[PDB]
């Protein structure tokens, strides 16, 4: 959960279009591919941070949903390296294999 | 069409270092050189018209060279070509792009173009196109 | 990717039909872990398009090596060049040119001679009357089987 | 059929003129005899 | 387009010298048979003008001029010698047409015949012999008002308002082939399209007829208020411009190409479009209101299809009923447009009597204007 | 309470979104409409051009 | 003076604004390609972008714009400048400057039913929300069929036998519940609506 | 000296037409590996602890 301040009443709010990766459903794996899509931690290489736009009376407010990889990229920058306790918290949040 | 067919025999693979690209599947400077080596400046002019968008001012210099009786640029363009070649083409990765300039601009008599001229007729033909008879003192003696 | 770029459906139609149906039932992990004959036959079909439709194999033989960090993908490409020159020698009518391209085809087989079907190559030399390469390659195919005496 | 011989002389000059009016100065690159080139110029210059 | 979009006419005493950058640069100088010719001649006052017809040669810097004495003169940029053509049958000259794909052949329309002059292109004698003048005529095809060669040089057409059949001539076999239709009037003017696939034929009546040069078919255009006065084809032959006497309107009619087999039909769209209005407007000038508008008496297009010249005639309420030259910039693809360029003006007291473009001018276009002073001007348009 | 913005000078960047395209293309394939001089298609005018021909 | 509506259309890289009778559009990522349309004389009540049915329009008409007023429902064609059919160019934005056609491709009267939302399916069926609790559709085609107009409006809330019910029994037991929203499921071919009173 | 050329068009390829009236192979549908609790329950079955039905 997160909040942010917005200048002026939200005259509009939208996503921007999804890139989706085609599921290569063949005569072999057709019973073995989920009809549903995988969660972002599974697709955060092939798919960018999911893009959004809000409009107020002041203009556009452009932003993205951050992936676990963009959250890691933020922590590697906030700790200025590959170590620091926030990266050691990220490994305890996602678990060591997914981190 | 003869020269483009001869290139399927003497260049059966693309050489890494040739410049300014291709026409019909064959390198522009090789197509120009072997059309000139078989005397057909009209066949060479077809390549120079086909590849105009890469060749630029070389089309205008080739058309100056085509409209004198004696295969000559004016001293007001031959020495442009000498001042271009000595800055951009002497130490180039395309030896056809060297040889065609060494001919048309009568320059680097000190180079035999031997990455193109393997033989005594091609040595004679190269140096005979490089001949002057004329005491134009604007020419430096190292090109003369 | 290279098979997609060289118009795929052509190269797959050159295959033996037993492989054309195997290609539909092998999974990517079978093709990566277990197979060798579908991948070798797809390379051989890509090269047979070049040899039949008369591009020079040298450029595709080199592209097949950049895409490999270090692997076998070399002696099949040399054998393919040796074969390109041999199949061109059959159409070539200048005798000088035919003996030249045979004294080039021979030098490609003389690299890889431990791994050559010498029966087929020396029968394919008989089919061009190149008995010279039948003496030479058959010695270069004994010489390297016993390099110790 | 009595005047058809004047039609043949008229059509032949229009046929040569048609080709000189579509190729123009590109005809100077065409390999031909020196008397034929000297006539081809007279069909470029409109002298016939 | 409309006259309320033109730039002002040049100030009273200046002459238009040339077009450059799309602007017109100025300076201080550079019935009986006879009344029936005067009703249908291309010249705005054929009965009092010194100059009855002008025609360029279709490839060279040679031109022919018919005069009030029924001479035809020939001028050439490489000759100070000017041939004077006068036959015993040469009377009330109405039209001139040079043969394409020939250095040496000129057709002349007369009150009693057509004259085909042969002129030796190297040996231009001051008065060529009356043997160098082949005579063509047919009982009832008199007077001849207009002449039109096919672009391929092998056929000639002739018009007469008395005769309900266009006459096709082979000048080489000396044959005559009438194209008779079933009532309406005779023929006033004739215009080939540049492809040589189509022909416009106008009449004294509120009807024109377009024809096909392959199967010699005819397509009829009868929903007009007045006569079709003049017109011009586009350089591709895909469009025909025309004007109607009593209407201040430039119409356009399209003809798509024969992407299909097996029928001779002329093939126009089912109607025309209106593209320019010539109604009675004002324009503001440093010299006050000028008033413009009237009826389009002649129209001529450049070989390049980028300049249309229109010889408007004012009504006797607008500039005393003087004729005026309008210049339009044209576009033919993807859309057909008429943009204004400006107003072409001559010597103070001259009136434009005839207009035509040069067929082979390697620097944009060149407009020949014949003036009531008897002067000819040649106004280049650089593009 | 918020503060209001101010203005006084004016310029221009905005264009028309609809281009004034001078071709009646509503029907795409056939062209031209209710108006203008027209082609002699009818059977009555063609029967006239066999019997009388005005 | 009287009305303002502002929104986004992601699949064209443009935002939009209306002021009374008029509509304006610009790129939401920079403020660029700002352009407007004046071809009206009545207040805009709803706006919608549409993905067109294939084969009914020309290949430059990649999208349609739909507008609705108190009186009419206007349909315009959207297109893009100078996107030539080459190769060897990367994916860098819909900067081929956007253009409307000046010709209304269709128009269709409201019934006097005010419209408050417009949307479409991935197969180009255009749906509209009426103040009278109604879903509507634009049942458009290309040709003029002998018993089928080129374009027409249809209502999906007013059952086909409703003309047999005296309107005195409607104007005594009905009270406007405006459809304020339509949502569409192109993944299952389902359509949903939501009203003011939350039906 | 006339080196046996194709005259203008002469070719005779042994692979011409060939044709194949039909072909096929066994469909790969294994009942998993390690068979946890064994492979079949409520279809016509193969491997329950109830090895009966007919």
């Amino acid at each position: 959960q997160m909040t942010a301040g917005v200048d002026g009443h939200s005259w509009a709010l939208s996503a921007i279009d999804e890139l989706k990766v085609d599921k290569i459903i063949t005569p072999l794996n057709k019973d073995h591919i989920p009809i549903t899509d995988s969660p972002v931690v599974v697709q955060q290489h092939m798919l960018p941070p999911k893009k959004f736009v809000l409009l107020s009376a002041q203009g556009s407010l452009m932003f993205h949903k951050l992936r676990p990889v963009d959250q890691l990229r933020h922590l590697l920058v906030s700790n200025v390296g590959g170590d620091g306790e926030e990266i050691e918290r990220f490994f305890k949040l996602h678990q060591e294999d997914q981190a | 069409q003869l020269v483009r067919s001869f290139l399927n025999i003497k260049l059966p693979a693309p050489l890494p270092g040739l410049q300014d690209g291709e026409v019909e599947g064959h390198p522009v400077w090789a197509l120009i050189y072997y059309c000139m080596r078989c005397g057909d400046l009209l066949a060479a002019s077809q390549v120079v018209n086909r590849a105009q968008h890469q060749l630029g001012e070389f089309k205008t210099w080739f058309q100056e060279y085509m409209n004198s009786k004696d295969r000559r640029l004016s001293p007001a363009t031959e020495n442009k070509l000498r001042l271009h070649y000595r800055r951009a083409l002497r130490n180039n990765t395309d030896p056809y792009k060297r040889a065609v300039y060494c001919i048309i601009g009568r320059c680097d008599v000190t180079d035999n173009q031997s990455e193109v001229a393997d033989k005594t007729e091609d040595y004679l033909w190269l140096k005979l196109n490089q001949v002057c008879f004329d005491d134009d003192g604007t020419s430096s003696p190292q090109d003369r | 990717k290279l098979l997609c770029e060289h118009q795929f459906t052509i190269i797959v139609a050159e295959l033996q039909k037993e492989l054309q149906e195997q290609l539909k039932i092998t999974t990517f992990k079978d093709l990566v872990i277990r197979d060798k004959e579908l991948t070798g036959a797809l390379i051989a079909s890509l090269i047979n398009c070049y040899i039949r439709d008369n591009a020079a194999v040298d450029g595709i033989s080199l592209h097949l090596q950049d895409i490999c960090p270090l692997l076998y993908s070399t002696d099949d490409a040399i054998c393919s060049k040796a074969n390109e020159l041999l199949q061109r020698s059959r159409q070539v009518q200048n005798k000088t040119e035919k003996e030249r391209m045979l004294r080039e085809s021979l030098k490609e087989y003389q690299k890889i001679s431990n791994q050559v079907d010498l029966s087929n190559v020396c029968a394919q030399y008989r089919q061009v009357r190149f008995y010279e390469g039948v003496v030479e390659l058959s010695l270069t195919a004994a010489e390297k089987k016993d390099p110790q005496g | 059929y009595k005047t058809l011989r004047f039609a043949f002389r008229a059509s032949l000059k229009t046929a040569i003129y048609r080709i000189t009016t579509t190729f123009g100065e590109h005809l100077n690159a065409v390999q031909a005899s020196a008397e034929h080139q000297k006539r081809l110029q007279q069909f470029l210059e409109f002298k016939e | 387009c409309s006259l309320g979009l033109f730039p002002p006419p040049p100030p009273r005493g200046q002459v238009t010298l040339y077009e450059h950058n799309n602007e017109l640069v100025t300076g201080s100088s550079y019935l009986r048979s006879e009344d029936l010719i005067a009703e249908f001649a291309q010249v705005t006052n054929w009965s009092s003008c010194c100059l009855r017809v002008f025609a360029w040669h279709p490839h060279t810097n040679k031109f022919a001029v018919a005069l009030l004495d029924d001479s035809v003169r020939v001028y050439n940029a490489s000759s100070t010698i000017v041939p004077s053509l006068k036959h015993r049958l040469q009377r009330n000259v109405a039209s001139l047409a040079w043969k394409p794909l020939s250095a040496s052949v000129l057709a002349v329309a007369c009150q009693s015949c057509i004259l085909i002059w042969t002129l030796d292109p190297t040996s231009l004698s001051t008065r060529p012999s009356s043997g160098c003048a082949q005579v063509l005529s047919h009982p009832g095809h008199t007077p001849v008002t207009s002449l039109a060669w096919a672009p391929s040089g092998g056929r000639l057409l002739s018009a007469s308002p008395v005769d309900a059949a266009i006459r096709v001539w082979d000048v080489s076999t000396e044959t005559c082939v009438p194209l008779p239709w079933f009532r309406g009037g005779g023929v006033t003017n004739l215009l080939w399209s540049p492809d040589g696939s189509k022909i416009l034929a106008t009449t004294p009546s509120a009807v024109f007829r377009v024809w096909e040069a392959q199967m010699w078919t005819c397509e009829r255009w009868p929903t007009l208020s007045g006569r079709c006065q003049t017109g011009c084809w586009s350089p591709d032959g895909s469009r025909l411009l025309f004007t109607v006497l009593g209407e201040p309107l430039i119409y356009s009619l399209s003809f798509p190409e024969r992407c299909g087999e097996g029928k001779g039909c002329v093939g126009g769209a089912k109607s025309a479009t209106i593209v320019a209005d010539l109604s009675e407007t004002t324009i503001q000038t440093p010299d006050g209101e000028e008033r413009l508008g009237g009826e389009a008496h002649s129209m001529v297009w450049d070989p390049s299809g980028e300049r249309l010249a229109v010889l408007m005639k004012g009504k006797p309420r607008v500039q005393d009923g003087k004729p005026v030259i309008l210049l339009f910039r044209t576009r033919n693809s993807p859309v057909f447009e008429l943009l204004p360029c400006g107003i072409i003006q001559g010597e103070p007291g001259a009136q434009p009597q005839l207009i035509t473009f040069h067929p082979s001018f390697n620097k944009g276009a060149l407009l020949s204007v014949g003036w009531s002073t008897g002067r000819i001007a040649h106004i280049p348009l650089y593009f | 309470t918020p503060t209001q913005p101010g203005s006084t000078p004016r310029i221009s960047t905005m264009r028309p979104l609809a281009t004034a395209y001078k071709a009646s293309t509503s029907d795409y394939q056939v062209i031209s409409d209710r108006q203008t001089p027209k082609k002699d298609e009818s059977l009555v005018s063609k029967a006239m051009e066999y019997m009388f021909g005005w | 003076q009287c009305n303002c509506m502002m929104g986004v259309f992601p699949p064209i890289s443009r935002a939009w604004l209306t002021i009374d009778s008029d509509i304006f559009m610009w790129n939401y990522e920079d403020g660029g390609d700002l352009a407007y349309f004046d071809g009206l004389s009545e207040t805009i009540l709803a706006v919608g972008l549409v993905k067109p049915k294939a084969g009914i329009f020309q290949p430059h008409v990649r999208h349609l714009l739909v507008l609705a007023t108190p009186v009419d429902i206007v349909i315009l064609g959207l297109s893009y400048a100078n996107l030539q059919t080459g190769s060897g160019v990367l994916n860098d934005s819909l900067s081929g400057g956007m253009q409307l056609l000046p010709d209304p491709l269709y128009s269709l009267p409201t019934d006097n039913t005010y419209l408050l939302t417009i949307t479409s399916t991935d197969n180009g069926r255009i749906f509209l929300a009426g103040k009278d609790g109604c879903l509507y559709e634009v049942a458009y085609q290309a040709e003029a069929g002998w018993f089928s107009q080129r374009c027409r409006k249809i209502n999906h809330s007013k059952s086909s036998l409703s003309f047999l019910v005296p309107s005195l029994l409607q104007f005594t037991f009905s009270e406007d519940d405006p459809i304020l929203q339509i949502a569409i499921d192109n993944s299952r071919n389902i359509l949903y609506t939501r009203s003011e009173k939350g039906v | 000296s006339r080196r046996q050329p194709n005259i203008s068009v002469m070719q005779s390829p042994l692979v011409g037409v060939t044709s194949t009236p039909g072909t096929g192979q066994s469909m790969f549908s294994p009942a998993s590996i390690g068979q946890p609790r064994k492979t079949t329950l409520s279809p016509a079955q193969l491997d329950p602890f109830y090895t009966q039905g007919d």
Side-chain angles (χ1 to χ4, degrees):
Chain A
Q1 48 173 331
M2 184 176 176
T3 47
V6 170
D7 359 72
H9 165 69
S10 302
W11 280 93
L13 172 61
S14 192
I16 291 163
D17 311 65
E18 285 195 353
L19 288 170
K20 296 182 180 178
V21 187
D22 301 278
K23 302 177 189 177
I24 314 305
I25 290 167
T26 70
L28 310 182
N29 64 349
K30 52 165 184 61
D31 324 298
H32 316 74
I33 285 176
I35 303 175
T36 43
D37 304 349
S38 340
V40 69
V41 73
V42 183
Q43 304 189 358
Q44 54 172 359
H45 54 326
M46 310 306 285
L47 297 183
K50 181 173 174 172
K51 198 171 192 182
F52 294 92
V53 54
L54 182 158
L55 304 184
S56 75
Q58 289 82 331
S60 321
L61 286 89
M62 302 299 307
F63 64 100
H64 318 75
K65 178 69 182 55
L66 300 183
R67 308 168 294 172
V69 68
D70 315 303
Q71 285 182 337
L72 179 63
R73 193 180 195 301
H74 173 249
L75 295 182
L76 294 171
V77 173
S78 72
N79 295 237
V80 201
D83 53 313
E85 204 229 310
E86 287 173 345
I87 306 157
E88 209 196 278
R89 290 169 205 152
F90 187 94
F91 270 72
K92 298 175 194 105
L93 176 60
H94 292 280
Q95 310 170 118
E96 294 175 30
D97 329 79
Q98 298 293 328
Chain B
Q1 180 61 11
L2 176 64
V3 163
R4 200 201 75 185
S5 307
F6 179 79
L7 288 184
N8 297 315
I9 309 165
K10 290 287 189 169
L11 294 184
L15 299 180
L18 304 183
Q19 295 191 1
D20 319 335
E22 292 168 41
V23 167
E24 291 176 359
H26 302 93
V28 166
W29 294 108
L31 286 171
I32 292 164
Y33 178 84
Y34 292 115
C35 289
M36 293 172 61
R37 186 65 187 96
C38 295
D40 192 347
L41 303 186
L42 303 175
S45 197
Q46 288 181 63
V47 198
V48 175
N49 280 276
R50 286 158 163 262
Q52 172 180 310
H53 305 310
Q54 314 100 269
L55 293 174
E57 262 208 276
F58 182 81
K59 173 169 170 177
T60 38
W61 308 342
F62 195 86
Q63 287 194 250
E64 188 179 328
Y65 175 92
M66 282 183 82
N67 288 265
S68 62
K69 302 173 181 179
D70 325 283
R71 305 177 181 184
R72 286 176 173 207
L73 294 174
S74 64
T77 302
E78 215 183 59
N79 299 307
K80 300 179 191 117
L81 191 168
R82 294 193 177 89
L83 288 172
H84 181 289
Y85 174 93
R86 294 181 200 165
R87 294 181 184 163
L89 302 177
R90 193 192 189 294
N91 300 11
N92 194 286
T93 55
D94 186 328
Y96 297 101
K97 190 173 183 174
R98 275 164 48 217
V100 171
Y101 272 69
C102 300
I103 292 162
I104 291 170
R106 301 184 172 66
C107 64
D108 240 287
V109 178
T110 34
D111 182 7
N112 290 358
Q113 318 306 307
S114 302
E115 313 99 313
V116 192
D118 53 342
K119 285 162 172 193
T120 312
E121 280 205 18
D122 289 52
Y123 176 89
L124 287 170
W125 180 79
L126 170 65
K127 301 305 182 184
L128 286 169
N129 282 280
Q130 290 185 326
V131 169
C132 294
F133 304 92
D134 335 66
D135 200 12
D136 182 347
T138 72
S139 61
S140 36
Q142 293 174 320
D143 320 71
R144 196 193 234 217
Chain C
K1 193 181 194 281
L2 188 64
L3 291 167
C4 288
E5 288 164 336
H6 289 283
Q7 304 173 100
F8 198 84
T9 305
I10 302 179
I11 303 173
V12 173
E14 317 297 353
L15 295 171
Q16 298 190 80
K17 279 215 149 229
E18 295 59 42
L19 305 176
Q20 296 181 7
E21 302 303 322
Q22 183 177 322
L23 195 68
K24 306 174 189 177
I25 64 171
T26 299
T27 71
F28 180 67
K29 64 179 179 180
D30 303 297
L31 195 74
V32 164
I33 298 166
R34 297 172 171 155
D35 213 316
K36 290 189 179 184
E37 196 169 294
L38 287 184
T39 44
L42 285 164
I43 292 167
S45 287
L46 169 61
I47 289 176
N48 273 279
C49 292
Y50 269 65
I51 297 175
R52 179 189 65 211
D53 311 320
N54 282 273
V57 300
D58 319 67
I60 194 66
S61 290
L62 288 169
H63 196 111
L64 287 164
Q65 286 165 76
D66 172 89
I67 70 180
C68 295
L70 192 292
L71 236 306
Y72 184 95
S73 317
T74 302
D75 302 335
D76 50 285
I78 292 165
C79 191
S80 293
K81 184 62 181 182
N83 179 50
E84 185 211 71
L85 295 171
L86 184 55
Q87 305 313 329
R88 285 181 177 143
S89 86
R90 289 165 175 196
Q91 303 190 60
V92 168
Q93 300 182 14
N94 175 11
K95 180 179 174 190
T96 272
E97 216 76 63
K98 188 181 185 106
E99 280 192 14
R100 180 182 68 72
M101 292 183 74
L102 288 164
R103 296 177 185 120
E104 289 163 357
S105 179
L106 178 59
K107 292 178 182 131
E108 297 307 306
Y109 294 120
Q110 279 169 325
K111 297 168 193 173
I112 57 164
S113 52
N114 296 70
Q115 300 177 115
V116 175
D117 179 357
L118 188 73
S119 185
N120 183 350
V121 176
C122 291
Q124 287 203 74
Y125 288 158
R126 277 176 267 188
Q127 291 162 14
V128 294
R129 302 183 166 174
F130 192 59
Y131 313 107
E132 186 181 276
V134 180
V135 179
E136 284 186 48
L137 186 62
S138 305
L139 294 172
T140 317
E143 176 190 78
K144 302 184 194 155
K145 290 184 179 184
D146 175 21
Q148 288 173 331
Chain D
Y1 78 86
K2 298 200 163 200
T3 44
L4 190 63
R5 67 188 197 79
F6 297 95
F8 188 70
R9 189 174 190 230
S11 65
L12 187 57
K13 281 196 166 185
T14 53
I16 297 165
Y17 271 125
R18 197 178 299 146
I19 302 170
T20 61
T21 59
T22 56
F23 291 89
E25 296 176 21
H26 294 288
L27 297 182
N28 298 309
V30 180
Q31 297 181 4
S33 86
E35 196 178 87
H36 294 143
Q37 291 177 324
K38 191 170 185 174
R39 288 186 184 102
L40 197 61
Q41 180 61 1
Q42 294 170 320
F43 282 106
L44 288 163
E45 296 179 305
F46 284 89
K47 293 178 182 166
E48 284 285 2
Chain E
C1 200
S2 54
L3 282 173
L5 298 175
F6 274 74
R12 288 165 184 148
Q14 291 189 356
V15 176
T16 49
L17 299 181
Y18 57 92
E19 196 200 295
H20 181 69
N21 296 347
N22 315 259
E23 298 187 281
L24 289 174
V25 184
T26 59
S28 50
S29 206
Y30 33 46
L31 302 190
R32 314 168 169 181
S33 31
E34 293 88 328
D35 32 312
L36 189 70
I37 290 161
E39 203 201 329
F40 297 114
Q42 294 170 347
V43 174
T44 55
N45 307 290
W46 176 96
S47 51
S48 58
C49 189
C50 188
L51 199 164
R52 284 183 160 170
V53 196
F54 179 107
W56 285 117
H57 177 274
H59 287 265
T60 64
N61 294 301
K62 303 175 195 175
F63 64 93
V65 186
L67 299 180
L68 188 62
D69 72 340
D70 299 304
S71 62
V72 180
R73 296 185 188 185
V74 176
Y75 303 92
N76 168 48
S78 57
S79 180
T80 53
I81 309 177
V82 176
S84 63
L85 315 185
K86 285 195 178 190
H87 204 273
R88 192 183 62 72
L89 303 178
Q90 199 170 320
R91 290 191 175 199
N92 296 299
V93 178
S95 176
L96 295 179
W98 291 96
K99 186 200 149 212
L101 310 179
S102 232
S104 46
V105 180
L106 175 63
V108 185
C110 300
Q111 189 177 7
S112 68
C113 62
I114 304 163
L115 300 174
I116 310 301
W117 285 92
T118 54
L119 305 177
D120 320 80
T122 47
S123 298
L124 293 177
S125 67
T126 51
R127 190 182 182 180
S129 289
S130 53
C132 308
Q134 166 181 333
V135 188
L136 299 174
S137 64
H138 196 279
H141 194 79
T142 50
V144 185
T145 47
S146 187
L147 290 175
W149 290 98
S152 61
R155 299 177 179 143
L156 174 63
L157 308 179
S158 70
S160 183
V162 185
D163 185 28
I166 298 162
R167 308 307 181 103
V168 196
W169 304 89
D170 173 2
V171 178
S172 76
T173 68
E174 299 180 311
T175 55
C176 185
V177 190
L179 300 172
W181 52 81
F182 188 79
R183 206 228 273 163
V187 201
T188 51
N189 195 28
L190 284 167
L191 292 167
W192 288 90
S193 54
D195 59 357
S197 90
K198 326 186 208 307
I199 307 152
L200 171 64
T202 55
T203 77
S205 31
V207 188
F208 70 84
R209 292 179 181 278
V210 189
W211 292 76
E212 178 191 336
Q214 190 183 32
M215 292 294 184
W216 298 79
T217 79
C218 180
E219 194 165 270
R220 172 179 152 118
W221 302 89
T223 51
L224 305 167
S225 70
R227 75 184 194 193
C228 181
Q229 174 61 13
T230 194
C232 53
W233 295 98
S234 52
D236 59 358
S238 82
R239 309 176 193 281
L240 174 64
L241 309 184
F242 70 90
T243 61
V244 180
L245 186 148
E247 294 174 32
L249 299 177
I250 307 184
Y251 293 101
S252 188
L253 175 65
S254 52
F255 299 83
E257 174 58 328
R258 293 184 164 187
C259 200
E261 221 288 286
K263 263 137 212 171
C265 292
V266 181
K270 298 200 176 204
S271 82
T273 58
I274 297 170
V275 196
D277 175 42
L278 309 177
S279 66
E280 292 165 85
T281 66
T282 44
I283 300 187
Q284 296 182 8
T285 73
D287 317 357
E289 279 189 7
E290 275 292 356
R291 288 179 184 197
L292 292 167
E295 294 175 57
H297 172 89
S298 198
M299 299 195 298
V300 192
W301 220 332
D302 59 329
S304 27
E306 251 269 317
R307 296 296 178 292
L308 180 75
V310 178
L311 182 57
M312 182 170 63
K313 189 169 184 170
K315 295 174 192 172
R317 293 184 175 180
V318 180
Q319 295 181 342
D320 322 320
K322 290 160 205 154
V324 178
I325 300 166
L326 306 170
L327 186 67
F328 294 87
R329 178 170 181 172
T330 40
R331 294 177 174 169
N332 282 299
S333 188
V335 180
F336 180 59
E337 275 226 75
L338 282 169
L339 301 175
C341 177
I343 302 176
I344 288 177
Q345 190 169 272
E347 310 169 305
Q351 294 184 11
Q353 300 305 278
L354 187 62
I355 57 168
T356 192
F357 280 113
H358 189 302
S360 53
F361 182 76
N362 307 23
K363 296 192 178 188
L366 179 68
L367 186 70
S368 293
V369 187
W371 299 103
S372 61
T373 49
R375 195 171 193 176
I376 303 167
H378 302 292
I379 297 174
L381 313 177
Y382 297 119
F383 63 87
Chain F
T1 319
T3 305
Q4 294 182 305
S7 187
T8 285
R10 178 162 224 177
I11 327 180
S12 59
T13 273
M14 185 184 295
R15 63 174 186 84
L17 183 54
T19 297
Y21 219 92
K22 300 160 192 167
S24 37
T25 46
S26 53
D27 305 47
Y28 175 73
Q29 185 61 232
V30 297
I31 280 61
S32 80
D33 72 327
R34 181 176 175 177
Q35 214 200 51
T36 62
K38 271 166 173 166
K39 189 178 179 109
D40 197 333
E41 294 205 334
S42 104
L43 297 179
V44 182
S45 46
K46 289 169 188 170
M48 285 284 281
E49 201 153 290
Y50 272 81
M51 295 178 67
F52 299 110
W54 264 310
Chain G
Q1 288 157 90
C2 289
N3 192 36
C4 178
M5 308 177 70
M6 189 161 62
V8 187
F9 294 138
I12 61 168
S13 308
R14 301 292 179 284
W16 62 266
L17 172 66
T18 66
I19 305 182
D20 303 303
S21 45
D22 311 359
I23 188 168
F24 309 84
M25 304 186 74
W26 68 101
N27 175 26
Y28 49 69
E29 297 222 60
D30 49 21
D33 201 30
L34 172 66
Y36 86 99
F37 178 86
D38 40 16
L40 291 179
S41 76
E42 245 278 51
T43 303
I44 303 174
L45 304 182
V47 185
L49 189 74
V50 170
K51 186 188 182 195
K53 295 177 192 184
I56 299 184
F57 312 100
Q58 292 302 309
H60 71 289
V61 188
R62 293 189 178 190
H63 304 79
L64 315 169
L65 180 63
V66 187
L67 307 177
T69 72
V71 293
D72 205 6
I73 308 162
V74 187
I75 306 185
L76 298 156
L78 278 170
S79 66
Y80 295 87
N82 304 356
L83 292 177
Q84 300 191 55
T85 56
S87 190
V89 185
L90 297 176
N91 300 293
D92 311 82
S93 81
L94 282 65
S95 287
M98 191 178 76
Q99 293 177 50
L100 282 169
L101 303 179
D103 321 62
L105 295 177
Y106 293 128
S107 220
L108 290 177
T110 52
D111 321 330
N112 316 260
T113 292
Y114 280 47
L115 303 183
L116 307 175
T117 266
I118 305 175
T119 187
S120 58
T121 52
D122 262 294
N123 69 27
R125 295 173 65 190
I126 313 172
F127 292 95
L128 333 90
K131 191 186 170 183
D132 55 0
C134 292
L135 183 65
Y136 283 90
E137 186 183 344
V138 193
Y140 82 93
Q141 58 176 76
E143 295 188 285
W146 199 298
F147 304 107
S148 191
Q149 297 160 279
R150 287 190 61 201
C151 195
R152 60 180 165 278
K153 185 185 70 190
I154 299 186
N155 187 296
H156 293 315
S157 277
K158 295 169 183 152
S159 306
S160 55
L161 298 178
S162 54
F163 73 91
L164 302 176
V165 182
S167 55
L168 200 73
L169 305 179
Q170 298 163 355
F171 282 100
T172 46
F173 296 101
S174 189
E175 180 201 276
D176 312 4
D177 184 21
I179 297 184
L180 301 184
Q181 192 193 357
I182 305 168
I184 295 181
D185 178 2
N186 301 310
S187 74
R188 313 181 191 92
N189 290 307
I190 307 176
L191 179 157
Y192 296 90
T193 69
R194 176 182 61 95
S195 72
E196 179 201 276
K197 305 171 196 175
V199 187
Chain H
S1 317
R2 188 171 64 175
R3 250 66 175 153
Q4 296 186 348
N6 308 73
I7 311 303
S8 307
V9 298
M10 184 171 61
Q11 295 189 1
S12 302
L14 296 180
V15 297
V17 184
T18 303
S19 200
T20 298
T23 187
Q25 294 187 357
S26 305
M27 190 177 291
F28 182 82
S29 301
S32 296
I33 65 83
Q35 305 84 262
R37 187 50 177 270
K38 308 203 304 151
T39 58
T40 60
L41 186 63
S42 54
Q45 90 231 276
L46 176 63
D47 197 23
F49 72 90
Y50 179 80
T51 184
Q52 260 302 334
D54 217 334

